[PDB]
Write a protein that binds this ligand. Structure first.
Ligand SMILES: O=P(O)(O)O[C@H]1[C@H](OP(=O)(O)O)[C@@H](OP(=O)(O)O)[C@H](OP(=O)(O)O)[C@@H](OP(=O)(O)O)[C@H]1OP(=O)(O)O
Ligand SMILES: O=P(O)(O)O[C@H]1[C@H](OP(=O)(O)O)[C@@H](OP(=O)(O)O)[C@H](OP(=O)(O)O)[C@@H](OP(=O)(O)O)[C@H]1OP(=O)(O)O
Ligand SMILES: [K+]
Ligand SMILES: [K+]
Ligand SMILES: [K+]
Ligand SMILES: [K+]
Ligand SMILES: [Zn+2]
Ligand SMILES: [Zn+2]
Lengths: 369, 168, 5, 168, 369, 5
């Protein structure tokens, strides 16, 4: 049974994005705490990630974008406003006390784990703080400041010829896509809502460019997708992907805003369905790096990643939530699982099979025997 | 809503290391381990130790409400501290228990919830009801001697409070 | 914005 | 006031055993050891264990007054039980601690003082003030369901009671 | 440093002699408990004594005296009254529930320890329950029912040619004397009040009989004896005794009613003085068997034997009494030691030296070179 | 008596 490494820094739950802001880092602390009380903590190798310095963040980002982040504060907020606009820091990506500390922990977790995978001293490595996939080389976007994912992947390329990147998050993983848009060594597959939704990118025809053409897979979706519909379009596509792209290390971003009843999301997935993807990936027995991502009904974010951690340990846990410091957060029910809503699935079988086929064609264009 | 191409967008792809080349990455600068998963201990023994770690804690706060102190001592901070005490002592139960009672005296771990004074708690419920969830101003004007990040940790712990009923 | 603050 | 001589007064003197003869005395029929004085343990560790044995006890009686429960758990019966738990487990701290928390659940030792009900205690203070220190009649007429020797043990423990003030 | 074995059965404190009766077994439990809290318990080998059966009690006593004791109860108290008078069970030796159990524990402790000494697996052995020295072959006397001392000594004779018996108790040790009155193998030395006092025996001229003549030493005394006077007459006499009687096992009865402020006693000794005797004996490095005996101001009985146990371990203890279940018993002071009273010492130097000399003559009559 | 009950 696969060996799992879990990365966590106690401080991460305590950093705060701002009044009225949906991204709430505290959800990782909630997970952490459930893991301890579900007895899972016990069963995996627990690491505190040292802070990632500007040194390794600039391995992808601008020497003067990170410089800006290292420097900016809420003190000198009116002094910098020039650079604030050039870098996207505001309306939905606030400045906030500790921001750079927050980035260092998220990035440290992902990088340390990548190394751990390259050093071949784990099979799976988990960092729920990480997964922040909207970030760009020279600007912040969609609550993401540093793209820990890219940096993580860049380290893996040192030992792995082909790195597969899978993205479940309801929002299209455009940061990780754009960063690797012109390379054939990394294939970016993404399943997301599309049409009057952020980030506006990742439609059927977004295939890549140059050497990276036919290496950026996307599955655009409308509202209300079931576990059943999602499963029936994830497994086929990913089996082909493995078949064709034949990777040697997987990085699964396990965005939890694709769950039902999310604050920002509008999909109808249950923890069970959501996790079935993690389990399917894990089954392909490749060095795997689970990251988190979005999720804005934190009670369920907690539930999800707690469950999905169990999946990486292939151990069973009861629906009965164990007592914990935040036990009272979990409704009148205090259960682990969520059920789907009456919400209407506007992804007709006809619409999913059209897209599926188009992708199967795209994937066939890769070399094989 | 557009994806861009160019030196200022894509990442420089890191070349695969030669069979002779080495990545040169110091692992101690990157991580520090907090729990080994393959221990000479069994679930029962760890479980047992956790009970003991809890008992000490209750007896600690008895030396300067019974159920209250026990619950206080049963909170996660105490448990986490119990799992580190094990790992720091190389999973030696007998050695780890000394750690918990260093010189015949027990150890107290109190989270921000339990640690704050009655009057600090009071201040917080005035600052919230007055500034909502604006935690930098809540400190500046109401709890300026506390560090922002302790006020955050407190907030979330306080949201589960019993006497706290914002719902109906 | 970016998403929905 | 007289010392007597004769077969019906003096003892028959037991003859010294031959260098080949053996006394023939089964030592297990005569004694059973309760504490070895040469232990692999140090004073500190025993002391520490005693603190732990006390903490469990307090946490035990928290699971069905803080200072009261701690004092209750600090009484001698609990300590004596702690010194036996050590010896029974061959002075293995790690093994002995399991004994104290058998299956994740702590153990309670209560002397007759603590163990009696409020109403039994009450009965006793009526029986004493009425029959003085006549403990067979105190049982017969007031606490007939208790064994005489438990009433004795209780008596002496009760004589140190705080609310007890026969002196001025 | 000498090895010590301590014998105790938890039940012994709980047996009760009767309303208004001075002998209170609870004083042993008080000692036991101090020993634990003074940290001394820790330092010696602790044994629970199994019950001594009629088998070994009849090794000295009547087959029908023990039979009587095994049988008698407070139930059949009016049925037996015939035998009650023949055996002395009444006015100051009551019948009481558990009586025979009590005897078995007191005797078991002494016998087990004797064996332990013969088996050469201890240097000192301590049984505070024991020491009950007024008992006779066919009758109870002075609160004593079974003479554990004799039985103990009888076992020691199996390995020891000469057994010395020393008796500090304020009352003359006539049970142990009478039992060995005609033998030269056991020498019984006793220091006690005399003249209108119990048991009426043990004056200067009580020397023994037959083979046992010049082997029963006695020191008669009046009221108010100091530590200073006592020390100055104990050491000289005992050094001669060792010199002459040359024993190979000592049995010291450490009666605590010779202390100051006893309920029944009228001597003016402090724990310190009293113990100086135990220390002096111990110094002669012989297999030693410490027993208790009388003592009727139990707070001090507790103090004494606790202290004297330390002496056998030659460890220091503070005057500060440690907390314990019966801590509140010990006055406003909560100290270990007692000081002597203004009470007048009617043992003039002239009177002590007259007696001393007479005894030195008696002891010279023994064989030597 | 024997001693002093
Ligand atoms: O404390 P915050 O991080 O600001 O989040 C709270 C919190 O949501 P979470 O419990 O999911 O963190 C409230 O939930 P309760 O405290 O009531 O359980 C929620 O209230 P509702 O769940 O009733 O919406 C409230 O939302 P609102 O401010 O709209 O009342 C929302 O604050 P934010 O909306 O600022 O995140
Ligand atoms: O409980 P018991 O075994 O019968 O002994 C008690 C007890 O004496 P101890 O404390 O030494 O056992 C009393 O002492 P306190 O309870 O007052 O501390 C004492 O009272 P005094 O010390 O004030 O004399 C009293 O004696 P009395 O009955 O004369 O009041 C005496 O009972 P006995 O005399 O029956 O032994
Ligand atoms: K996605
Ligand atoms: K690509
Ligand atoms: K004497
Ligand atoms: K003799
Ligand atoms: Zn998202
Ligand atoms: Zn006496």
């Amino acid at each position: 049974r696969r060996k799992v490494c879990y990365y966590y820094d106690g401080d991460v739950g305590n950093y705060y994005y701002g009044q009225g802001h949906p991204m709430k880092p505290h959800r990782i602390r909630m997970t952490h705490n459930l893991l301890l009380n579900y007895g899972l903590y016990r069963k995996m190798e627990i690491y505190r990630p040292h802070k990632a310095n500007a040194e390794e963040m600039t391995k992808y980002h601008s020497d003067d974008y990170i410089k800006f982040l290292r420097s900016i504060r809420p003190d000198n907020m009116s002094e910098y406003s020039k650079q604030m606009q050039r870098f996207n820091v505001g309306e939905d990506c606030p400045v906030f006390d500790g921001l750079f500390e927050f980035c260092q922990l998220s990035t440290g977790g992902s990088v340390a784990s990548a190394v751990k995978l390259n050093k071949q001293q784990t099979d799976i490595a988990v960092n729920w703080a990480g997964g922040l996939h909207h970030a760009k080389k020279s600007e912040a976007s969609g609550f993401c400041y540093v793209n820990d994912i890219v940096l993580a992947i860049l380290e893996l390329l040192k030992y792995h010829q082909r790195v597969l990147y899978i993205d479940i998050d309801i929002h299209h993983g455009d940061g990780v896509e754009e960063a690797f848009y012109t390379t054939d060594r990394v294939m970016t597959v993404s399943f997301h809502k599309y049409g009057e939704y952020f980030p506006g990118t990742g439609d059927l025809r977004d295939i890549g460019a140059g050497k990276g053409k036919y290496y950026a897979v996307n599955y655009p979706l409308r509202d209300g997708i079931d576990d059943e519909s999602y499963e029936a379009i994830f497994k086929p596509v990913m089996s082909k992907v493995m078949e064709m792209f034949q990777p040697s290390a997987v990085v699964l971003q396990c965005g939890s805003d694709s769950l039902s009843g999310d604050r920002l999301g509008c999909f109808n997935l249950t923890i069970k369905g959501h996790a079935k993807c993690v389990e399917f990936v894990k089954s392909f027995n490749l060095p795997m790096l689970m990251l988190g991502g979005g999720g804005y009904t934190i009670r369920n974010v907690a539930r999800c990643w707690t469950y999905e951690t169990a999946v990486a340990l292939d151990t069973e846990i009861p629906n009965e939530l164990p007592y914990n410091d935040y036990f009272e957060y979990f409704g009148p029910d205090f259960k682990l699982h969520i059920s789907p809503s009456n919400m209407t699935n506007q992804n007709t079988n006809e619409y999913l099979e059209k897209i599926k086929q188009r992708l199967f064609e795209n994937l066939r264009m890769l070399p094989h025997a | 809503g557009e994806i861009r191409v160019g030196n200022r967008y894509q990442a420089d792809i890191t070349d695969l290391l030669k069979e002779g080349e080495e990545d040169g990455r110091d692992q101690s600068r990157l991580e520090t381990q907090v729990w080994e998963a393959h221990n000479p201990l069994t679930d029962k023994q760890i479980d047992q130790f956790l009970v003991v770690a809890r008992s000490v804690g209750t007896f600690a706060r008895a030396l300067d409400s019974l159920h209250m102190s026990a619950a206080a001592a049963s909170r996660d901070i105490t448990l986490f501290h119990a799992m580190d005490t094990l790992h720091k002592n190389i999973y030696d139960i007998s050695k780890a228990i000394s750690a918990l009672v260093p010189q015949g005296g027990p150890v107290l771990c109190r989270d921000e919830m339990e640690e704050w004074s009655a009057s600090e708690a009071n201040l917080f419920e005035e600052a919230l009801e007055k500034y909502g969830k604006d935690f930098t101003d809540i400190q500046q004007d109401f709890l300026p001697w506390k560090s922002l990040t302790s006020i955050i940790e407190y907030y979330y712990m306080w949201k589960t409070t019993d006497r706290y009923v914002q719902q109906k | 914005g970016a998403x929905r603050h």
